[PDB]
Amino acid sequence: DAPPLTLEGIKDRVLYVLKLYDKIDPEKLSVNSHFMKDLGLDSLDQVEIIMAMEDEFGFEIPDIDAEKLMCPQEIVDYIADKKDVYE
Amino acid sequence: GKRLFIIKPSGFYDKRFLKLLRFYILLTGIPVVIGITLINVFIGEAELAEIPEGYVPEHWEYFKHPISRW
Amino acid sequence: AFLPSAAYLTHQQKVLQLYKRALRHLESRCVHRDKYRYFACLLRARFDEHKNEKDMVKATQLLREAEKEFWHGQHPQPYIFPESPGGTSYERYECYKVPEWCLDDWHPSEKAMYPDYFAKREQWKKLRRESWEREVKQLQEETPVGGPRTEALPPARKQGDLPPLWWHIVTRPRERP
Amino acid sequence: MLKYIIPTMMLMPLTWLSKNSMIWINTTLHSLLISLTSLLLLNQFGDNSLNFSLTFFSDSLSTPLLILTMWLLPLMLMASQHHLSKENLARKKLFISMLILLQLFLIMTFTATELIFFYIMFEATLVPTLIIITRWGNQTERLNAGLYFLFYTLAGSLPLLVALIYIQNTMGSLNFLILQYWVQPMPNSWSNTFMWLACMMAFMVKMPLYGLHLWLPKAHVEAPIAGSMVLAAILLKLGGYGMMRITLLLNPITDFMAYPFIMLSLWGMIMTSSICLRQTDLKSLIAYSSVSHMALVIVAILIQTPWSYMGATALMIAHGLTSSMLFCLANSNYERVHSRTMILARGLQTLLPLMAAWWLLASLTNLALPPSINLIGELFVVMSTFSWSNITIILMGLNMVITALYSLYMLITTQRGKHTHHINNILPSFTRENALMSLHMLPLLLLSLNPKIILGPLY
Amino acid sequence: TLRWQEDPEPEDENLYEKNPDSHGYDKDPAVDVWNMRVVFFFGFSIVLVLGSTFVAYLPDYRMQEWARREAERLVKYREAHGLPLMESNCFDPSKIQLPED
Amino acid sequence: SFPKYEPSRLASLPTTLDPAEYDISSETRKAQAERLAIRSRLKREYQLQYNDPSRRGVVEDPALIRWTCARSANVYPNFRPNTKTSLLGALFGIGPLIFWYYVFKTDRDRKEKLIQEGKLDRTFNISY
Numbered sequence A: 001d002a003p004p005l006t007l008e009g010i011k012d013r014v015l016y017v018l019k020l021y022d023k024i025d026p027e028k029l030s031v032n033s034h035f036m037k038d039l040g041l042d043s044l045d046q047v048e049i050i051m052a053m054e055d056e057f058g059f060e061i062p063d064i065d066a067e068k069l070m071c072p073q074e075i076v077d078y079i080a081d082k083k084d085v086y087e
Numbered sequence B: 001g002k003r004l005f006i007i008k009p010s011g012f013y014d015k016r017f018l019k020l021l022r023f024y025i026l027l028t029g030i031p032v033v034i035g036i037t038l039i040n041v042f043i044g045e046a047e048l049a050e051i052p053e054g055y056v057p058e059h060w061e062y063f064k065h066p067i068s069r070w
Numbered sequence C: 001a002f003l004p005s006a007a008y009l010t011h012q013q014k015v016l017q018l019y020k021r022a023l024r025h026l027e028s029r030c031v032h033r034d035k036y037r038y039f040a041c042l043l044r045a046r047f048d049e050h051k052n053e054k055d056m057v058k059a060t061q062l063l064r065e066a067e068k069e070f071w072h073g074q075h076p077q078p079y080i081f082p083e084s085p086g087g088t089s090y091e092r093y094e095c096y097k098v099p100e101w102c103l104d105d106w107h108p109s110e111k112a113m114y115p116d117y118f119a120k121r122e123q124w125k126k127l128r129r130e131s132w133e134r135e136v137k138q139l140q141e142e143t144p145v146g147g148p149r150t151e152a153l154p155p156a157r158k159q160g161d162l163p164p165l166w167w168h169i170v171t172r173p174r175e176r177p
Numbered sequence D: 001m002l003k004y005i006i007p008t009m010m011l012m013p014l015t016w017l018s019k020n021s022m023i024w025i026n027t028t029l030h031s032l033l034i035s036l037t038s039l040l041l042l043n044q045f046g047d048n049s050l051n052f053s054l055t056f057f058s059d060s061l062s063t064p065l066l067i068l069t070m071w072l073l074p075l076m077l078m079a080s081q082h083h084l085s086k087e088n089l090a091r092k093k094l095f096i097s098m099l100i101l102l103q104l105f106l107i108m109t110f111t112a113t114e115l116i117f118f119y120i121m122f123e124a125t126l127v128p129t130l131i132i133i134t135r136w137g138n139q140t141e142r143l144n145a146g147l148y149f150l151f152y153t154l155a156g157s158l159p160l161l162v163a164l165i166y167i168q169n170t171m172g173s174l175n176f177l178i179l180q181y182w183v184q185p186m187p188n189s190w191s192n193t194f195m196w197l198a199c200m201m202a203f204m205v206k207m208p209l210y211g212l213h214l215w216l217p218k219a220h221v222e223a224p225i226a227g228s229m230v231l232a233a234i235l236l237k238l239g240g241y242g243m244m245r246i247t248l249l250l251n252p253i254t255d256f257m258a259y260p261f262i263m264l265s266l267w268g269m270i271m272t273s274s275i276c277l278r279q280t281d282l283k284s285l286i287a288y289s290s291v292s293h294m295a296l297v298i299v300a301i302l303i304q305t306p307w308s309y310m311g312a313t314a315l316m317i318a319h320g321l322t323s324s325m326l327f328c329l330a331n332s333n334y335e336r337v338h339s340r341t342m343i344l345a346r347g348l349q350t351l352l353p354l355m356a357a358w359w360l361l362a363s364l365t366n367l368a369l370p371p372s373i374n375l376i377g378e379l380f381v382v383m384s385t386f387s388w389s390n391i392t393i394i395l396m397g398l399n400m401v402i403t404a405l406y407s408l409y410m411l412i413t414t415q416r417g418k419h420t421h422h423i424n425n426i427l428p429s430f431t432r433e434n435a436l437m438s439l440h441m442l443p444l445l446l447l448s449l450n451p452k453i454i455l456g457p458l459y
Numbered sequence E: 001t002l003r004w005q006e007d008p009e010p011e012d013e014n015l016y017e018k019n020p021d022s023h024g025y026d027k028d029p030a031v032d033v034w035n036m037r038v039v040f041f042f043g044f045s046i047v048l049v050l051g052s053t054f055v056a057y058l059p060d061y062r063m064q065e066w067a068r069r070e071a072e073r074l075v076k077y078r079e080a081h082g083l084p085l086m087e088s089n090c091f092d093p094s095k096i097q098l099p100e101d
Numbered sequence F: 001s002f003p004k005y006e007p008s009r010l011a012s013l014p015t016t017l018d019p020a021e022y023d024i025s026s027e028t029r030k031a032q033a034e035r036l037a038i039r040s041r042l043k044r045e046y047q048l049q050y051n052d053p054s055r056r057g058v059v060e061d062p063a064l065i066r067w068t069c070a071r072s073a074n075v076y077p078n079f080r081p082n083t084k085t086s087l088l089g090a091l092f093g094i095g096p097l098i099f100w101y102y103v104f105k106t107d108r109d110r111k112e113k114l115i116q117e118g119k120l121d122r123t124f125n126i127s128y
């Protein structure tokens, strides 16, 4: 039970989920691509993205931390901090 | 692989107290149990009998177990 | 409401929080994936219909009636994540989160079982007690007169020193001890 | 009874001639030896009491109280030696001397055949406890606690002296063996009404009765640990022993003069348990629990049936042991965190697991888990009060529910939950504290195997 | 102004600092270990164990076993002769003079 | 429309249905800024006392001492006997005592009157 996590697996899974989004062209996004500026997404798109990542990883990100998750690298770092990986 | 240190409070003193308590209880518990077994097996309990005529018993001759009589 | 770094909640924050709560409760009412997808798109269309409204009083009234609408149609018990507050496994492992200052009371007989770990602990404590005065001196000159206005802490400006007030948020126990 | 009095007064040259570092060892050792010696009082007979002399006797009621006192003294010596660590040597010897003197007065109190000698010892017990509370207590209001305690006791007890002297002049003797055979009915009049009030109010104050209990959450709180142990464990039972001895002369006027205090003590235990539900102080919570249990003993003595008397003496012994252990545990928490607030130090089971086990056992015996002698006494009193009237079962059931509620509230607040973040001086439990807890627990659990030696003189 | 001259509150002494093998009895290790030995021996090995042994073998505490034996004897004697096992009156009515009314 | 949520003592009004939440006026913003400033200053004090490496003890909370002193040692200095206090004391102090006294006295009188006529079945009652 409870297999461990790494930054490589977290980044691969978060990029998988963001790649399955129809509003993002998969050949353009990267680990540090912004949402409002570099990808042209609304705030509701950011909210739906955050909810998708919550459903993917199975734990809830609070709103006061969800408003500041703006690129995939910050999502990776937030999940890594919340789940205490690379110990 | 991937063994992590588990932070726990100092369990040395509690185990030391429990070991001391067990040792100091058993130090007289074992000889008393052995002595009670040897009293029961070899000395044995008394047998109820009617008082002989003209004979008055001592006050400790009205009890069954040897330890109670003592 | 209750925020560490801000004194209030903006209008856009209220709208986003309402959107997330409404979508979660709609997922609770609509347990199947395709049905939830359809009704989520309908809710997204409803939210996008009034997106471009510049009247502040009209947007405020729309938000108020949307909150009333959500309260009329909420689930009696929505889906809570297992570790989320109100969940089934929320604060379950708090009995195993022993703080790190209990290692200083260990007997030397059981301290000899982990020599390298306790050496690393000693050098960590040496670093903390060396950096404390520098970090409190940094914090003293950065707070404006009259006390801090928010609860945000500054980082370490120069090289060599650690951020102020770092010990109890770096050495916090793991989620699964 | 001179074979126990003389070693007790010989403890005084033992503590006044010992070294600067060997006073605790010598006093604890020799008090434990005399406590072992105290078992010779169990030569009780089914018809006659064990009458030693003209002045001293010991039946089956005073014997458990004597054994409890002589066992409790080394526990107080072990408990009180950590907070007196930095004290002057002469003051340390004076503290041990007051404990020895209190034990001497207590063992002369339970064996007094004459009633006026019982009164003299029972009010000689006031001075060492008042001195202990008002000198070695830690707070500001220890002086006010001593004033309240002293004046409640003396205002209750001066009419008792007047009434006892009247009984001596009218009947011709205050010897308890004579008064068992020379007793007369007490008719219904105003004179006999005030006789009953004068003979009863001293022990109603000392027990305490609800409404006269205002000195208890002060004297039990501002005292040191040894003072709290001897106040909860023995000193509340002087009132019970007094009502058991003095009810013989007050018949048949008790059957209607006992109604107001029965209503005060039946409703009083509900009020004190409800007070226990909303207490911010641990020591005050234990004191109010003591008030509730002594109200139970008051009702049992006042209805005067055999089952009630057996339940009363068993409940007295059991509550003495349990309250002493609870006060010791609260004192250990106080030494760790230097505050008596119940909400301050939380979640101590993750830090102090065996102490948490001791807390659980003390809480379980507090709510009368069978087959502890707590439950035996409480059950017998419940049966006798049901025989008295049937709605007493409603009152007793409500009291039991609230008692379980506040005992588990104590345990859950102090031991369970998330620990306090900013408290980092939680040292591991010493061998001394664990030994004290086990010496409180093991006799209490062992007495369930042979509960017949604590069931009073009419077992 | 400045108040009266008084020492500050002393820091609490950790007994486990200078002596990690402390039982909490005394600051000197020898006195502490001897106090532990004294309490553990004379409390548990002497008082508790031999006290329980003494209570267990009490010589017929309060005559209960004798009462049972005598009740057996009396029940057998009364059952053999057809006598009632117990009467409603503890004392003989022949030796009691009721008040005249 | 929708049924209006009526608040009760044991069911408070939600923060999303409060009309005073959506207030944007500058007085409320100033009040919220002042409250945040007080909270941040107190948190700074606590964290300064909390992260000290040379501290081994209890970070004393004056609010908790204030709460316990108010709960315990202020009630009688701030008590004035008036109509309300005396009325509540007479209702809760001597009310239940009188009620239970009359209940128990009536029950025991009925039982003792039934016993003396031999109307109460006491056939196997020899334990009391």
Ligand SMILES: CCCCCCCCCCCCCCCCCC(=O)OC[C@H](COP(=O)([O-])OCC[N+](C)(C)C)OC(=O)CCCCCCCCCCCCCCCCC
Binding pocket: D152, D155, D156, D159, D162, D163, D166, D191, D192, D194, D195, D197, D198, D201, D205
């Ligand atoms: C802790 C606070 C509460 C304390 C309560 C203490 C008890 C309350 C009642 C005490 C009454 C006084 C002692 C009575 C002793 C009676 C002995 C006796 O022989 O009685 C029969 C005797 C009868 O007289 P006699 O025996 O001489 O006559 C022979 C008998 N006849 C009458 C038939 C001819 O009673 C008395 O002499 C009077 C008794 C009543 C006294 C009333 C005055 C005192 C009122 C109560 C004061 C209570 C304390 C107040 C202060 C509290 C603190 C500030």
Ligand SMILES: CCCCCCCCCCCCCCCCCC(=O)OC[C@H](COP(=O)([O-])OCC[N+](C)(C)C)OC(=O)CCCCCCCCCCCCCCCCC
Binding pocket: B065, D063, D064, D065, D067, D068, D071, D317, D443, D446, D447, D448, D449, D450, D453, D454, E047, E048, E051, E052, E053, E054, E055, E056, E057, E058
């Ligand atoms: C006494 C008044 C003062 C009170 C405070 C006293 C403080 C000082 C203390 C001094 C020493 C202690 C004195 C009291 C001693 C009481 C004990 C005692 O002596 O008992 C005598 C009793 C006497 O029993 P008895 O009376 O039936 O024996 C018959 C009598 N003889 C021996 C003569 C034939 O001892 C026992 O009952 C021992 C029985 C055997 C041992 C126990 C076997 C069962 C154990 C449990 C098994 C598992 C059950 C399931 C568990 C499930 C999980 C929980």
